[PDB]
Subunit: 168 residues, 3 copies
Amino acid sequence: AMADLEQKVLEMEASTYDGVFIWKISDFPRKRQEAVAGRIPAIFSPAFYTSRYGYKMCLRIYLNGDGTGRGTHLSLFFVVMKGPNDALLRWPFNQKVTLMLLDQNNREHVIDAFRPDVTSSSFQRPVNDMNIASGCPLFCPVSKMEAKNSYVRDDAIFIKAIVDLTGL
Amino acid sequence: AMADLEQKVLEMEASTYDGVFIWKISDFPRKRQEAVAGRIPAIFSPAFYTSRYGYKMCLRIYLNGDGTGRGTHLSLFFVVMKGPNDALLRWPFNQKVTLMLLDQNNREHVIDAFRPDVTSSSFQRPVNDMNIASGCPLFCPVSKMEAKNSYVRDDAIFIKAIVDLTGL
Amino acid sequence: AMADLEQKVLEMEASTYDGVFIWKISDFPRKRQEAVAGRIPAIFSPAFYTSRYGYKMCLRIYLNGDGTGRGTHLSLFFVVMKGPNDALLRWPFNQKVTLMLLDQNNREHVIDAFRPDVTSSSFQRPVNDMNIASGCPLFCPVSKMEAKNSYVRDDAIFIKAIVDLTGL
């Protein structure tokens, strides 16, 4: 209950309530290796929300890829989580989501966006803590970022997510 | 102790600073019974604020009623609390307050509102931790909500408070 | 230890993310003496930010003065701190800053403002936890506030900082 409180505090510290989230991933080189090695393929980010009492969401990343991108790309996914106020929200979750890998030279960010499918189980009201993730298996070529460039800086990268709030 | 810190974290986690607060009350059936039994007549909600450094407030609810509503209605009250920045605020507190019991079918919420009386002890600058509560003794007939309907769902209800910020 | 987590909780509780910060200093008389006595000349305030992922900053105050104000005035300084997202921000920090000592009678606040100098090391990207502070050595005559008046009330004063967000 100390790592539980510690974890809670850590979660609160990272939460945002306007649909915009910036996830700094430090110790990049080590985590990158742990992915390549197959020890820790993926990492979950802290949770964030669409509004003070809105949808609860988090991100999941595979530094060395997943599925169609396994070993060739950085795969990034969006996750709808069971939120405390789900009973008050509209389902399925259907807000457009934009995912980005920030260029720390601020000249060319890697960006992609997707429209949730109303028929996918990924966006129905959560029964478990997290619904099945969905996103970009081929988000970024390992060569592009990682292998230097301006995405990795001082052994860290920044992932940014923007959830369109239209209709909320 | 660890109970002190843990309590602070919970408070911080529930705080809002824009005059809007949604209070989710879980274990509704049990709490409802504890009120009917007379063991725990009322419950206080976590605190929320009108602005980052605004008035501090909380709600107090009697699942089996208080005063004129005892045994017949759900009584809901508003409470002005001693805030850390009270010295910088205007007194008496005189913002219009709207109290709601949310319909989880989102079609017919129970709603009431009141205008604080500048002559009431309930709204003067707090001397004690909490001023005398003020609100709605006959907020909602026990029959309406509670006894099924669409207010209680999966053993929980949602109370919402909106403090008008005109002039702040 | 616990003091580590307790400290983090304290910092989170005080943080703001819109460039506006109000610092309540309690036990004023005692702290004032500790300054006059030379035991504790300065005090740092909790940190606050320009935006959710913006610059990290704090204030430093000398209740009995510093440098040109030592012994005659209250000296107040602004501090740019190493922030978690500095890599994504523009450097040097060059936002106009307004510092205030609030009149609790709300009629005459002590106010001053300054323009960061793009050539000062105080505003370059932080290498250490905190850059050199800069601000107002002659912010307020010890006679004005402190010595009574309406700045000190119930043994407390309020310092307010407003960071102009133009261009951010």
